[PDB]
Amino acid sequence: AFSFKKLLDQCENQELEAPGGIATPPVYGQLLALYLLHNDMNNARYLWKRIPPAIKSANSELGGIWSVGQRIWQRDFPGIYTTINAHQWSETVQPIMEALRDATRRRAFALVSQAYTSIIADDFAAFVGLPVEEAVKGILEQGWQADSTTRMVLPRKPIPNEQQLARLTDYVAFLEN
Amino acid sequence: SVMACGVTGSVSVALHPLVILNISDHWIRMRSQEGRPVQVIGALIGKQEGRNIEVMNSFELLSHTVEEKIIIDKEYYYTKEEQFKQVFKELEFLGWYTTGGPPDPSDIHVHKQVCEIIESPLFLKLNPMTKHTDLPVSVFESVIDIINGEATMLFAELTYTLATEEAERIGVDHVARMTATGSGENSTVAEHLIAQHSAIKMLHSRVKLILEYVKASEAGEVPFNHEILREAYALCHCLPVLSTDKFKTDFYDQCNDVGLMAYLGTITKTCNTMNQFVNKFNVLYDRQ
Amino acid sequence: LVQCILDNTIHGRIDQVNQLLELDHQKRGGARYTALDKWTNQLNSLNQAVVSKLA
Amino acid sequence: TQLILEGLISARVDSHSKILYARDVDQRSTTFEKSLLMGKEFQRRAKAMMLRAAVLRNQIHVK
Amino acid sequence: SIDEIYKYDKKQQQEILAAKPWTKDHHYFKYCKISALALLKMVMHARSGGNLEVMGLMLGKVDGETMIIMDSFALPVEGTETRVNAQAAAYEYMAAYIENAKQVGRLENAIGWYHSHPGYGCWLSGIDVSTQMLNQQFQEPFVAVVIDPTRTISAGKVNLGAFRTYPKGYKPPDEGPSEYQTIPLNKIEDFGVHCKQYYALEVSYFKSSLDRKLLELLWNKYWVNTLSSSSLLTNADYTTGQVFDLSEKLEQSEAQLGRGSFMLGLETHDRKSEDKLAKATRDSCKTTIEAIHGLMSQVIKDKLFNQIN
Amino acid sequence: PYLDVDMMDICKENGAYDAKHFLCYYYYGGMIYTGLKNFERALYFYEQAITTPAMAVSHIMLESYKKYILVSLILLGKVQQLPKYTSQIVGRFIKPLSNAYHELAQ
Amino acid sequence: IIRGNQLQEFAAMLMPHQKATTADGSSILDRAVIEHNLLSASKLYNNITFEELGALLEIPAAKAEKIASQMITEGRMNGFIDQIDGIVHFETREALPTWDKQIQSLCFQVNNLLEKISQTAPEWTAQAMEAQMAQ
Amino acid sequence: PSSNLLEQFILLAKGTSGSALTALISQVLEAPGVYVFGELLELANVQELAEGANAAYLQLLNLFAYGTYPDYIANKESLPELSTAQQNKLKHLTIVSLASRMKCIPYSVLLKDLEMRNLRELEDLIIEAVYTDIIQGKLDQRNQLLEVDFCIGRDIRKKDINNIVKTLHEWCDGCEAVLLGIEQQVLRANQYKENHNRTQQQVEAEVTNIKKTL
Amino acid sequence: MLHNIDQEMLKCIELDERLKAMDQEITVNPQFVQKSM
Ligand SMILES: [Zn+2]
């Protein structure tokens, strides 16, 4: 995460300092995939609109990443997972693509835990993009409740003294003057 | 040596904050008038009931230095006594006060004159140049001891208390609250923090005494003072006052409430500065 | 019970589903925060109006 | 629902079991929320008035 | 220099008394500085036996627009003023005290009079207005100080109101503090009738040596126990009353400001309305800093005792 | 970064600072904030742009007013009333002009 | 807390039965015993259930709740009764009064200890004076 | 009168011992009032018993001084059989240790650490302990918690002294840290006052310079 | 929430300091001084 943020900052700086005004295709791909990782859909869409069509035509991987981003925008998790695992990502894109996969998994897990008191097993499996039974065992080891008769899943929803004293002193000093 | 050894207090002395304030005012004004902290001399008045002496008020006496001796204007003292008779009669003369450190061979003569005036005078000395946290006020009585075959008057320290009323308590508490406030605002939290600093120091000194006693008991002393060290250990086990979710709930509840009140106070101060800025700006360039 | 609550004699309310009478204990004894909040908003809006008019 | 929209009923409609629950909100939670909103608005208006002094001290206007 | 104010310059006082700058301006004297000694003595006299109506003289000096009170003392009152005024054997006592002080050191002369108002507020009644007007005739300057012993318990603190009268016929140009005080039904009538015939001075206490002495003594003997809960301010009658009073003061300020926008060229309104805004803000700030100090002592002690180790 | 900071000192540009630049800056900043889904700051910038005292009509000003209407509809669900701190002929001529956005708001 | 064994001697003493002219109100002896038992419960028990309170008082839960309500009505026992859960909340001193008294008791016990060492061991006081003078 | 009886037993132990000393220990453990046994442990005759053949009574006394009820239950064979008073006193000591360690005692801990099968018996023992001025506190039956405001301490002769010294040192270090923190804040307040003062004479100097200019 | 309140504080304190700085700058203006003198 922290390394990904540093890489995103470096790529943004490189884009801002591009000599000919056009960054290398690896930099653009890293920028787009890292924007997808942080769920920053607006920035990813604007960057895709900024990219000239020449790069898109010469690099179908960029088009695949944009299709994955569009799937993320529509939030169709089964389609998102299918599209991510369908296109081969280069050595500079595969690890960050898997990080995006993990982030999507965690996001869907949290959304199901929060919004869904009860959810169908098939619906949960589609949301997590994983088969039903091992998802059931994974949520059972997660301390959740599952009903086998109705195939319903019941998720379980889950300043130091020095800083204070400095704030208290700033209370008096502001009011002292 | 003008101090008696092995002599215990025979009477109980009660002192009021008014006497301390009068002594302080006399010392401060005499310092301001004549440079160095010139020694002051005054008199003590109040009510005496048998062996219970209550010093409620104090006033000043005129003194002159002749032949390197302080001569109290006892005629002035009697004139002012009759003057006080016109305002308060229940108050009777009890003794005299002065400022300084340990008794000097000049206060003995003054106390001799005051004992020549009345039956049993009280001697009080205040130390305005003290450095410890204790009260620099001591009350001494007149005792006659046979030193080298000659009767020499000595001073015996009295274990005096400090008595006050509800009225004086409230008034002095108000004056303390005023001293919290500064000129515009000279020092407001400084006195507050020193006030808690003294309280923590008082408790810190008590902990040192207990810690030293345990260390001595480990080597010598009584191997076990019984109910004391047993209880001392119990108070080290009661030291971590266990807090539950509700207490931290309420503690954070109180902090947020007044913290919001503190935020409101800052906003009120800020808008007044903005209002002053707007008023000055409307005259700087703007018309109407 | 309904008649008593209508007469303001009872500081409580009725849960008919469970055959229940729940009384508001009102043990907080506050309502000072309500006065503080009204004082806060009225004068801050007063300050905003004054600043806008003076500028 | 219409009465709640207009007011003077102070209620919540639990349409699951069809039970009408009265609303009794704590004053402090509402007070803190709107006090924070006031402070944000006060800061925003502080910025705006602060901005206004810029165009007048530096004589900024449409010619 | 903390002790500089204690220096008495007789020639300088004579020069000021010969100059009489107060004759050039009826609002000349604006500040009243009171020694911790004089405050304590006047509050102690005022408290006396519960709620006694008593009075005395104040010794001090003048410095620019500031009146300085250094000391105070009382006068004999046989049979609780059985004669006219609270004086009886007053002249004799006063002169004796003056000469005695001149000898023992005190060279400060009469600067004013103080008296107490047990549980009715700090203000000047018709009698006190006439007294301070006569105190503006003889003894050119003079200031009327009013104390509240029963409000030192009720309000908890209470200020020692310092006042000066306007000469007969003279109108305050615009002076309007709009300060609210709770006055009993049998006293509010007279209060409202003579309230504009005088003005209030700003009372201030130079951080000297007598003041910090008392603060130490109390917090080293009686207030040495800094527990007592931590907030007697929790009882929401004093803060809430100050909060409600602050709300009313600014509400009236807006009502005057709204009506003052139609009148173009009313300078008096501007000064007074801004004066109200300033005074109201300070009252809130002083209340705010008091509560902040309350929690600061709370936090340091509470954090220590509970989870030190 | 540089838009999240309040910049309360306008430069005269030695008298060459035309308030057209002020209007352009506020309109473009509001558009940028709208692009980043920061509707509150976009609405604030649009409101500040509207309140600029101008004696003539400009297309940038009209577009700022229209975007203000759109952002007010998005965020608060209604058109926020223009302050009595006010402006000049700007509002007087815009209100007739931007009638379609007022119909959309209605 | 009062058991049923002190009843006999007091009843014998009263008026070879009960004081005044008998009692027959379940004995005034037992009325006072139950009242003082509920007082002692209010001293310790922050809250109590109906069955456990009845077992403590050796009476049916209905009798216990009725007597508790009667005592609360007369102002002799503070608290309130919830009939759903069967829990009578005798006393709840928020969080500040409980904390203040504990600190005050802690400080008082510190002062009691310090006095005990000074009195029972004057040599410690001499050692304390020597220790404070050395540092 | 517990202290006087304990002192009398101490004086007697300086002389008669052996079988008589075991009888005295049994009387101590059976007589109510003695909540502290550190006075007896330091007597030289206790050490004589330590080198003496008899050790069951000495182990019982050692467990009463340091151990708790579960230790006695585990040592039910090596210790002399207790009476009702001895068992009640040991349970009181265990509750005292629990309260001293942690103030709000859940009922589960009380049932587990004291072999309490019936909660009514637990209530009876708790009220008996409180009424004999051993522990002061309040009971929360709805939450099944035992809030203890104050409790007595235990014996300290051999190994707890180091913990006490460590606890005292931590308290001393904590007090010094707060004292240093208060001093730093006071210095900061003085600096703010100086900065506020420094801003002041600059204004008057700015004012006076213009007055001289005009 | 306490941290957020303290964060708004530091913005207000800095805002007040900037307001005071301008007010001092206003006092430097001769026009205010000419009316004052
Ligand atoms: Zn009067």
Side-chain angles (χ1 to χ4, degrees):
Chain A
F2 186 75
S3 61
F4 299 147
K5 290 180 180 180
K6 272 190 168 179
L7 179 60
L8 179 60
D9 297 331
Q10 290 178 0
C11 291
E12 288 178 357
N13 296 330
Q14 288 177 358
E15 173 188 338
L16 294 180
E17 68 93 31
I22 171 170
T24 62
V27 170
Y28 279 153
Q30 289 169 350
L31 277 156
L32 194 52
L34 285 167
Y35 279 161
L36 297 186
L37 169 63
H38 296 68
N39 206 20
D40 201 332
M41 299 306 305
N42 307 328
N43 287 347
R45 181 179 180 180
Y46 281 124
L47 188 152
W48 167 261
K49 293 301 180 181
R50 177 171 57 254
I51 290 179
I55 309 178
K56 307 171 176 180
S57 60
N59 203 338
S60 59
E61 168 181 309
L62 189 64
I65 301 179
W66 175 240
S67 61
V68 172
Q70 286 183 332
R71 288 295 183 178
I72 294 180
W73 180 278
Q74 300 294 335
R75 290 153 177 162
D76 190 12
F77 301 91
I80 292 169
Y81 291 122
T82 303
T83 50
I84 293 176
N85 301 330
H87 298 69
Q88 280 79 7
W89 317 108
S90 66
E91 306 174 357
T92 61
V93 191
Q94 202 62 61
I96 61 172
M97 208 75 203
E98 281 143 355
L100 171 57
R101 302 199 43 82
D102 305 336
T104 304
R105 290 187 183 96
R106 303 173 274 234
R107 274 152 190 174
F109 186 78
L111 291 171
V112 166
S113 69
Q114 283 138 30
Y116 295 148
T117 304
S118 66
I119 182 175
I120 312 178
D122 300 330
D123 298 0
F124 180 81
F127 264 76
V128 306
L130 300 175
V132 179
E133 282 80 6
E134 61 88 24
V136 166
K137 77 175 175 64
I139 62 177
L140 285 176
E141 64 90 17
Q142 201 48 65
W144 287 4
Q145 300 178 0
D147 189 11
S148 60
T149 300
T150 55
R151 298 182 179 181
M152 299 301 298
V153 162
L154 283 80
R156 182 178 181 179
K157 182 179 181 180
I159 306 179
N161 312 338
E162 297 286 343
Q163 287 184 359
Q164 294 182 359
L165 291 180
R167 298 158 213 267
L168 306 179
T169 316
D170 298 330
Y171 291 165
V172 174
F174 171 77
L175 295 187
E176 181 174 0
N177 313 338
Chain B
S1 180
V2 299
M3 288 295 303
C5 180
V7 178
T8 60
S10 60
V11 295
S12 59
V13 180
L15 198 73
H16 283 246
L18 183 64
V19 177
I20 304 179
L21 208 51
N22 288 308
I23 299 173
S24 301
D25 180 71
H26 198 181
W27 177 84
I28 295 159
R29 174 186 58 256
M30 286 302 300
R31 178 186 179 182
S32 180
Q33 289 179 358
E34 291 181 354
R36 84 149 182 102
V38 181
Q39 174 180 1
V40 305
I41 289 182
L44 301 167
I45 48 180
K47 301 180 181 181
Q48 179 179 359
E49 302 179 3
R51 298 188 302 179
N52 300 330
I53 305 180
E54 179 180 358
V55 187
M56 302 179 59
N57 203 332
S58 62
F59 65 102
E60 296 176 354
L61 293 180
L62 181 59
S63 59
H64 303 270
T65 301
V66 61
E67 193 66 26
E68 294 296 327
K69 275 168 179 77
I70 299 178
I71 296 300
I72 303 300
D73 194 356
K74 297 183 290 294
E75 300 82 1
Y76 173 75
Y77 156 73
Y78 274 119
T79 288
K80 198 62 179 170
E81 204 159 353
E82 296 290 330
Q83 207 54 247
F84 288 127
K85 292 186 181 70
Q86 293 180 358
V87 289
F88 314 117
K89 189 180 185 294
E90 276 90 330
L91 299 185
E92 301 179 2
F93 178 83
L94 307 178
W96 69 285
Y97 62 85
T98 185
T99 44
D104 59 353
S106 180
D107 275 345
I108 285 285
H109 163 57
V110 183
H111 191 85
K112 181 72 170 65
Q113 313 168 74
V114 184
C115 200
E116 185 270 333
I117 312 174
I118 75 155
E119 207 88 2
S120 186
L122 297 184
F123 169 62
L124 194 144
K125 198 167 187 179
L126 188 142
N127 199 332
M129 303 301 300
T130 187
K131 297 179 180 180
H132 50 69
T133 59
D134 300 329
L135 174 61
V137 171
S138 300
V139 183
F140 305 90
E141 73 174 16
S142 60
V143 289
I144 299 180
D145 193 9
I146 303 179
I147 300 179
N148 300 330
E150 301 180 3
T152 303
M153 181 180 300
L154 302 181
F155 283 159
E157 183 176 359
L158 304 179
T159 60
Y160 70 100
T161 61
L162 188 153
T164 192
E165 305 152 7
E166 182 66 26
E168 314 171 12
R169 180 189 70 91
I170 297 180
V172 184
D173 178 50
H174 161 71
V175 183
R177 275 187 291 263
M178 288 180 70
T179 55
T181 62
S183 296
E185 292 84 4
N186 269 18
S187 45
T188 65
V189 67
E191 290 81 1
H192 209 75
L193 290 174
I194 293 296
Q196 280 80 241
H197 152 69
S198 73
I200 292 160
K201 185 157 36 172
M202 181 180 72
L203 272 300
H204 156 69
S205 179
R206 304 316 218 258
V207 182
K208 291 191 290 185
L209 300 185
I210 304 160
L211 178 50
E212 288 279 328
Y213 184 44
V214 180
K215 269 302 150 195
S217 303
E218 193 269 331
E221 267 288 300
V222 62
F224 189 48
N225 207 357
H226 318 303
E227 309 318 305
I228 294 89
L229 277 296
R230 184 268 306 156
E231 188 174 0
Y233 149 78
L235 259 49
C236 290
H237 252 228
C238 287
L239 203 54
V241 202
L242 252 248
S243 156
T244 54
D245 300 2
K246 49 179 298 301
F247 177 80
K248 297 180 180 179
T249 291
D250 295 7
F251 175 78
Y252 273 83
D253 273 351
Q254 186 175 8
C255 289
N256 291 331
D257 282 355
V258 184
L260 179 61
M261 182 182 180
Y263 189 60
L264 298 179
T266 56
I267 288 184
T268 304
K269 185 171 180 300
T270 309
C271 66
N272 181 86
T273 307
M274 171 184 307
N275 174 80
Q276 294 289 340
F277 162 75
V278 169
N279 293 333
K280 290 192 180 180
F281 199 90
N282 293 332
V283 184
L284 187 149
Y285 278 163
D286 188 32
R287 302 286 83 90
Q288 293 177 335
Chain C
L1 284 174
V2 164
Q3 292 181 3
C4 290
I5 300 178
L6 286 185
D7 298 330
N8 297 269
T9 60
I10 290 189
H11 298 263
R13 300 179 189 181
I14 303 179
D15 181 13
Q16 194 174 9
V17 183
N18 303 329
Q19 299 292 337
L20 174 53
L21 175 70
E22 295 181 1
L23 305 181
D24 187 74
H25 207 308
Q26 59 96 34
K27 66 209 163 302
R28 49 92 173 173
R32 50 145 268 178
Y33 301 95
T34 305
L36 292 189
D37 175 53
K38 292 178 180 179
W39 156 87
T40 294
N41 293 264
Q42 288 294 334
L43 301 190
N44 281 278
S45 60
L46 193 147
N47 166 51
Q48 293 173 359
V50 166
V51 170
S52 64
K53 290 184 178 182
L54 286 182
Chain D
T1 301
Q2 183 70 23
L3 288 187
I4 299 170
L5 290 174
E6 301 324 289
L8 291 175
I9 190 64
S10 159
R12 303 292 180 270
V13 171
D14 193 323
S15 53
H16 187 182
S17 54
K18 301 295 183 180
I19 299 181
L20 186 54
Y21 290 93
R23 165 49 40 214
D24 212 349
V25 67
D26 50 349
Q27 178 69 45
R28 174 177 171 177
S29 298
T30 306
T31 291
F32 268 77
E33 175 185 358
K34 63 196 290 185
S35 300
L36 183 59
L37 294 180
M38 168 269 311
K40 197 174 188 181
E41 292 290 337
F42 169 77
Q43 292 184 4
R44 187 184 67 92
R45 286 183 174 85
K47 301 170 186 301
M49 177 59 210
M50 207 86 179
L51 286 168
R52 183 66 175 181
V55 303
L56 301 179
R57 180 179 67 173
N58 304 283
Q59 294 294 338
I60 296 301
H61 55 274
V62 176
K63 289 188 180 181
Chain E
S1 183
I2 287 160
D3 303 325
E4 175 63 28
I5 195 167
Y6 290 83
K7 294 185 173 175
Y8 193 75
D9 188 349
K10 198 188 168 187
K11 196 180 174 190
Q12 184 234 17
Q13 280 304 290
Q14 290 168 317
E15 284 173 5
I16 296 155
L17 272 135
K20 308 172 188 189
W22 53 87
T23 59
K24 318 283 180 180
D25 182 4
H26 296 133
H27 215 294
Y28 180 77
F29 289 116
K30 293 180 185 64
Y31 311 108
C32 189
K33 280 186 189 156
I34 304 170
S35 73
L37 169 63
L39 166 66
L40 260 278
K41 230 200 281 184
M42 296 186 293
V43 171
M44 287 293 285
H45 183 214
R47 178 56 168 173
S48 40
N51 23 268
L52 244 293
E53 237 120 313
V54 278
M55 88 151 282
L57 205 74
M58 300 187 297
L59 299 175
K61 59 199 177 185
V62 290
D63 190 22
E65 304 176 305
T66 309
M67 312 200 70
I68 303 168
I69 295 141
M70 297 300 294
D71 216 358
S72 45
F73 71 104
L75 296 173
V77 259
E78 177 253 298
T80 334
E81 332 114 11
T82 1
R83 34 230 59 88
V84 264
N85 221 263
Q87 296 196 46
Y91 275 135
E92 315 102 279
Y93 193 98
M94 186 245 182
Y97 198 97
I98 289 275
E99 293 131 18
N100 298 161
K102 256 101 247 277
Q103 299 145 24
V104 297
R106 303 111 140 224
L107 266 147
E108 272 94 358
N109 293 308
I111 197 63
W113 70 295
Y114 74 97
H115 77 285
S116 68
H117 269 201
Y120 55 101
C122 297
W123 50 284
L124 282 203
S125 85
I127 280 108
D128 320 323
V129 163
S130 318
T131 306
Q132 184 46 58
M133 238 120 124
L134 277 167
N135 283 318
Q136 253 150 231
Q137 263 103 70
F138 39 84
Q139 330 126 158
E140 253 321 295
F142 254 53
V143 43
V145 152
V146 190
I147 324 134
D148 203 321
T150 339
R151 247 161 242 210
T152 318
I153 326 156
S154 311
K157 14 243 122 257
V158 114
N159 77 293
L160 260 67
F163 307 86
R164 270 180 63 79
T165 49
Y166 293 107
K168 193 178 191 170
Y170 176 71
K171 311 281 157 124
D174 25 62
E175 200 39 72
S178 307
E179 166 75 66
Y180 158 75
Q181 199 172 217
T182 320
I183 330 265
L185 280 195
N186 67 299
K187 293 286 194 163
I188 195 146
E189 337 163 5
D190 193 273
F191 164 67
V193 171
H194 315 273
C195 65
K196 259 342 126 247
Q197 297 175 3
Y198 58 85
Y199 67 87
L201 282 69
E202 186 184 289
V203 177
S204 111
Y205 281 60
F206 40 98
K207 239 282 136 315
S208 67
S209 6
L210 288 154
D211 28 69
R212 26 126 323 243
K213 252 139 192 146
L214 294 144
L215 153 104
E216 173 256 322
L217 295 170
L218 187 92
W219 232 278
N220 271 35
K221 225 233 125 173
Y222 297 113
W223 243 114
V224 81
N225 19 273
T226 344
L227 185 64
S228 197
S229 179
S230 66
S231 286
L232 273 297
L233 202 54
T234 300
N235 195 50
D237 44 17
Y238 183 59
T239 303
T240 307
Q242 284 188 330
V243 170
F244 204 76
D245 171 65
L246 160 60
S247 180
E248 298 194 53
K249 284 184 175 180
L250 294 187
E251 278 180 358
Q252 282 210 359
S253 301
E254 164 176 281
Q256 295 178 0
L257 279 173
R259 299 179 180 180
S261 299
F262 176 67
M263 179 52 210
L264 278 75
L266 187 57
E267 282 314 313
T268 78
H269 157 254
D270 315 326
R271 316 149 176 162
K272 266 339 121 193
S273 55
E274 297 148 1
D275 208 10
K276 289 153 207 131
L277 293 162
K279 288 158 173 246
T281 288
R282 265 87 59 89
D283 303 333
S284 180
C285 289
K286 267 73 175 175
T287 306
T288 315
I289 191 66
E290 278 149 3
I292 289 171
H293 289 187
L295 62 83
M296 283 186 75
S297 174
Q298 193 273 329
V299 171
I300 305 163
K301 167 167 276 197
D302 199 358
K303 285 317 198 50
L304 195 146
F305 278 152
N306 308 335
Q307 283 81 233
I308 182 64
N309 66 331
Chain F
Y2 274 53
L3 289 175
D4 284 332
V5 295
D6 57 357
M7 306 174 143
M8 55 282 294
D9 211 359
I10 304 298
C11 183
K12 302 198 177 185
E13 315 276 23
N14 299 324
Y17 189 92
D18 195 7
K20 293 184 179 181
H21 314 84
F22 180 97
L23 187 65
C24 290
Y25 163 71
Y26 274 76
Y27 174 67
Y28 298 149
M31 291 197 63
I32 288 176
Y33 273 106
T34 307
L36 299 178
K37 290 185 180 180
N38 196 330
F39 301 98
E40 176 185 349
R41 199 61 178 178
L43 193 69
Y44 167 73
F45 268 85
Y46 290 148
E47 182 180 4
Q48 292 301 317
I50 290 175
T51 53
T52 304
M55 73 297 291
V57 189
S58 67
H59 306 310
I60 303 162
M61 162 189 100
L62 180 62
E63 271 275 18
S64 311
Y65 194 100
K66 299 158 152 196
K67 295 269 200 293
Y68 175 84
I69 292 177
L70 280 155
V71 174
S72 80
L73 287 192
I74 293 165
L75 189 75
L76 303 180
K78 59 180 180 180
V79 170
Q80 178 69 24
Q81 299 292 335
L82 298 179
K84 264 67 68 178
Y85 201 75
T86 49
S87 179
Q88 278 301 325
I89 202 74
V90 170
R92 291 182 180 179
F93 284 168
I94 286 174
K95 186 263 184 181
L97 286 176
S98 58
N99 202 61
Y101 290 91
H102 280 285
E103 190 187 8
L104 188 64
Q106 165 65 54
Chain G
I1 193 67
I2 308 303
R3 282 82 179 181
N5 62 46
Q6 313 294 297
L7 178 145
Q8 332 301 311
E9 52 188 311
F10 202 53
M13 295 152 177
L14 284 192
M15 196 212 80
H17 187 273
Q18 266 107 70
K19 218 106 164 306
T21 7
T22 81
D24 292 71
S26 82
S27 189
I28 185 167
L29 194 153
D30 277 331
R31 293 292 178 87
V33 161
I34 295 155
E35 277 170 348
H36 168 57
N37 287 0
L38 286 171
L39 290 187
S40 311
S42 65
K43 305 303 151 41
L44 275 72
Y45 296 118
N46 295 296
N47 51 4
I48 194 157
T49 64
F50 283 157
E51 302 179 2
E52 300 185 34
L53 178 57
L56 165 66
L57 309 182
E58 306 174 4
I59 57 181
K63 181 179 180 180
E65 72 183 2
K66 180 180 180 180
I67 298 176
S69 179
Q70 182 181 0
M71 287 193 59
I72 294 179
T73 307
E74 300 181 3
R76 297 188 293 103
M77 185 183 61
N78 294 319
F80 50 93
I81 303 180
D82 201 327
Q83 197 168 86
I84 298 168
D85 310 328
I87 308 176
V88 180
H89 309 260
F90 284 149
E91 179 52 44
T92 187
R93 322 183 285 128
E94 296 291 327
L96 273 300
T98 299
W99 213 265
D100 297 358
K101 289 178 182 179
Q102 285 181 1
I103 295 185
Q104 180 181 1
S105 181
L106 182 63
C107 295
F108 191 72
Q109 290 163 11
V110 167
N111 301 328
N112 292 337
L113 279 180
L114 295 163
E115 292 178 356
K116 282 183 179 181
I117 318 176
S118 181
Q119 291 182 1
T120 61
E123 55 274 0
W124 165 88
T125 307
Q127 288 177 1
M129 297 305 108
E130 291 178 359
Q132 70 181 2
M133 287 301 179
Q135 283 73 241
Chain H
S2 60
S3 300
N4 301 330
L5 186 63
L6 195 58
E7 289 176 349
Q8 289 179 0
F9 282 147
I10 282 180
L11 183 60
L12 291 180
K14 301 288 97 175
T16 63
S17 65
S19 178
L21 185 58
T22 65
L24 303 184
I25 291 167
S26 315
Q27 290 146 33
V28 171
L29 300 177
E30 276 138 24
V34 292
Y35 312 140
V36 171
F37 305 95
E39 318 196 358
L40 293 175
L41 188 152
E42 282 179 348
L43 310 183
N45 284 257
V46 161
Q47 282 74 239
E48 183 178 1
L49 276 192
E51 287 102 12
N54 168 74
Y57 293 92
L58 187 145
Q59 291 180 0
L60 182 60
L61 186 56
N62 203 326
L63 191 147
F64 262 93
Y66 300 94
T68 56
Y69 194 68
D71 293 332
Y72 151 74
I73 297 304
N75 280 290
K76 189 176 175 66
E77 297 294 330
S78 67
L79 299 180
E81 40 187 60
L82 292 189
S83 80
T84 312
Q86 302 178 272
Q87 290 177 1
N88 294 330
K89 187 175 305 176
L90 187 52
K91 293 174 183 177
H92 289 172
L93 291 180
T94 305
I95 292 181
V96 158
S97 300
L98 300 177
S100 299
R101 291 200 291 109
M102 57 82 71
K103 298 292 177 66
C104 189
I105 302 169
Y107 284 177
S108 59
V109 186
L110 290 167
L111 298 182
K112 172 185 177 181
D113 295 355
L114 212 69
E115 292 192 318
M116 287 295 108
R117 64 185 193 279
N118 193 19
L119 192 151
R120 180 73 260 169
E121 298 182 359
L122 172 63
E123 304 181 56
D124 294 322
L125 183 62
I126 288 177
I127 64 181
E128 182 180 2
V130 175
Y131 294 152
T132 60
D133 294 331
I134 300 184
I135 50 178
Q136 300 179 359
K138 291 183 177 60
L139 284 86
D140 198 321
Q141 295 196 4
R142 183 181 185 182
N143 306 330
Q144 295 185 0
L145 309 180
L146 169 60
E147 306 179 4
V148 179
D149 297 331
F150 168 67
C151 47
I152 208 162
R154 293 291 305 260
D155 295 332
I156 44 163
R157 168 62 280 186
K158 60 182 182 180
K159 54 184 178 182
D160 303 330
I161 304 178
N162 302 331
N163 300 330
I164 294 165
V165 167
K166 181 180 179 180
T167 307
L168 285 173
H169 272 72
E170 289 179 1
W171 193 8
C172 290
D173 294 1
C175 291
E176 292 178 4
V178 180
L179 286 178
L180 294 181
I182 289 187
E183 291 178 1
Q184 290 178 359
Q185 301 299 338
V186 167
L187 290 179
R188 186 174 179 180
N190 295 330
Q191 290 178 0
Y192 271 107
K193 174 193 181 180
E194 181 177 350
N195 293 330
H196 174 60
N197 291 330
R198 179 182 293 106
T199 310
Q200 186 181 356
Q201 75 263 13
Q202 176 188 177
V203 172
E204 276 94 6
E206 196 271 341
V207 165
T208 51
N209 287 330
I210 301 189
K211 298 290 186 291
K212 294 173 183 178
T213 301
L214 274 74
Chain I
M1 285 305 302
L2 178 61
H3 191 58
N4 292 15
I5 290 179
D6 297 323
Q7 286 184 352
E8 305 274 27
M9 179 180 70
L10 295 174
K11 298 176 184 178
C12 289
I13 280 183
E14 183 68 28
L15 162 76
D16 183 76
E17 291 273 34
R18 295 169 182 179
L19 283 172
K20 286 186 175 181
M22 292 185 314
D23 201 81
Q24 175 185 0
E25 290 181 7
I26 290 174
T27 313
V28 185
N29 207 25
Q31 292 198 5
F32 175 78
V33 181
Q34 290 179 0
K35 293 190 175 184
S36 299
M37 297 182 60

